[PDB]
């Protein structure tokens, strides 16, 4: 499979905050075309983010990343006067790095890993408002020769939904078995979830594959998340399980039977599917 | 101490699906001998389970398991067309691999860990009912080499009880001072829990124990588990701190000032324990 | 930096059980002097505390250790007659020991760890009106070798405060920039949390800090806490970010909208901070 390279890229963004139906909002690439969740952003250990955001909404709004390197001035708080005004512009800018040695001979864990950015500023001073109604999205660092997926999919817990829907509006996920197939789970809002997926498993550490003979890390289908928690892993898609409707929900009972669940769909490669 | 061997062999297992008293549901091993939890199913990765599940409860009831290798037809979902009527029978099949390099250079991790089955029809399409009944039960799958116990405990958290029970009822586990103790830890219902044990501690790894000097995983005594989570550990009873009356219970306050706590009793080898 | 030296040094503390203004209740190292949290207990792994509990609150109170080695006449219940009259005095002693092999070729891990101690008996059997008014304290065991920090800052997540506090009351924790910051993270009550900070992150092992090019923990910067929940880490302050008004916080939208908040404010070495 594809292995990311050595990062060390200057990249530049626009991200548009908008108003969608139903008092809604959303992060986009595009006027017009914001989603929830925001595009997902991915880079390698040691690009740099320049982050244009227009703000299309009525109340002043921020963006805020976690994991990531950024001074005050992009911490997306009030507090640290980092927010964007009705009808304006602001560029944040997120650094990253690679795992090194400090001059003291201590080890700097580096960037990569399984993030999220969201908004810090509608509605409450920590963003209550603007996180309620969708301003959330994927963050994707790499590290050098991280193993490369062919789809890429995300899941956002917030309060009793999965990406602002419940009911059976949740997201279909389908690939072909075989896929390399990537989950990135994002919590966000008041309660507490356990992600599980039917038919399919993966490693508790950085990557959610396993790193080698030594690696201790235990292996799990089901995970503990809170708001703000984020994880993420990679699956062969049917491994030893095969194609079908291949449930993914939240497993406190009475959220999945509040519709705290969707479907993770694999198909042979000509499109069946069992079921 | 022994040490589990090679895995690959077919085994074939029945589980009675069986009215308990007070409304109550469990697996059982034989007719009329149902338990909650169920009996601990404990095999050793590349192993196949062959369970034929007889349903003798008025209603379509289930077998789900987490972590291992099924396909659809082991689903244990109405959507998958995996239940079982009143009165009929159905065999579930669970396969199990050890780890190894996939052709494309990448880990596959093996199956090996603390694991758990349930009912997933009974009440709602989720089990909610039947787990709420205890309809539950705990899996072992060993990696070749693993170390193995003397006893094995099973703990589950189902909403605000210890194995469907509180008060002074839940299950006191009685082990000998020296004696290799293995804890199974399941959650269930719609609750977060803290589990907690005194006098004793453990790694927090794939199977609870150091693996080796380069071991960086944290060494806890207490652990958060939400709905479905599972996991385990093995400790010597009584190791640095002697025979006793040691409680295990849930940290959160109310729940164990709500009877969510128990005794693990570690007794001298003639059986006196200080108290 | 400074690193532990081997352990094994027998040492001897008093604490004190005081009332504090408005109902409240702490440890102190002398009388009138109980703060919340408790003092910090640091040793190394191998050594021995002798404590001896001065309890001069109007109710039987107890001393509760996590991650030590401690024999049932130190477990701080009532059920082993461990706990301290009004007026009255106790000893409790806490052992620790260093990894190691046992004679069955099996590894026994070492105390070494972030843990706490709270009280066990004010309010109900399990303390929970102990805890509740401010009964609890940071213990910190280092390995031999582990580096050693500048500064140490504990947070108590307590029920929906930090350290009994809301508001605009919670602690500010001050540091230059560069200097190595160490977080102790300690939850308690009847509600789960997630800890995060801004402009920082740590690795999910033992130490907080990346142990090598092989070490495969996840890097974070939020982590779900449960009651009796303990964890910590080290940071180099404004590392990659800058000085500046550094927000710590639980991210459960409803709580840190509650208070749960408050500063960690690293400054330039002349004392200025952005803001
Ligand atoms: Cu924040
Ligand atoms: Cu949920
Ligand atoms: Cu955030
Ligand atoms: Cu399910
Ligand atoms: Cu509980
Ligand atoms: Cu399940
Ligand atoms: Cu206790
Ligand atoms: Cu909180
Ligand atoms: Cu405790």
């Not at 109340?59 to 304006?88: C, F, I």
């Not at 997926?149 to 602002?164: E, G, H, L, R, Y």
Request: charged share 20%.
């Amino acid at each position: 499979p594809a292995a990311a390279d050595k990062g060390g890229d200057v990249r530049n963004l626009t991200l548009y905050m908008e108003k969608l139906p139903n008092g809604e909002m959303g992060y986009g690439l595009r006027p017009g075309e914001a989603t929830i969740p925001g595009p997902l952003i991915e880079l390698t250990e040691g690009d740099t983010m320049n982050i244009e955001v227009v703000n299309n909404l009525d109340v002043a709004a921020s963006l805020h990343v976690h994991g990531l390197d950024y001074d005050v001035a992009s911490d997306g708080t009030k507090m640290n006067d980092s927010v964007v005004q009705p009808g304006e512009r602001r560029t944040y800018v997120w650094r990253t790095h690679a795992p090194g040695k400090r001059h003291d001979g201590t080890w700097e864990a580096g960037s990569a890993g399984y993030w999220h950015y969201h908004d810090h500023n509608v509605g409450t001073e920590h963003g209550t408002g603007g996180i309620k109604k969708g301003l959330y999205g994927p963050v994707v660092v790499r590290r050098k020769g991280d193993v490369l997926p062919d789809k890429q999919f995300t899941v956002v817990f917030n309060d009793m939904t999965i990406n602002n829907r419940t009911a059976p509006n949740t997201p279909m996920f389908k690939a072909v078995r075989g896929e390399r197939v990537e989950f990135i789970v994002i919590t966000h809002g008041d309660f507490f979830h356990t992600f599980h997926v039917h038919g399919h498993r993966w490693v508790d550490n950085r990557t959610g594959i396993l790193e080698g003979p030594q690696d201790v890390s235990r292996v799990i289908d089901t995970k503990t998340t809170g708001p703000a928690d984020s994880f993420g892993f990679q699956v062969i898609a049917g491994e030893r399980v095969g194609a079908g409707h291949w449930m993914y929900h939240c497993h406190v009972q009475s959220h999945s039977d509040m519709g705290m669940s969707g479907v993770f769909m694999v198909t042979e490669a000509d499109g069946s599917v069992p079921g």
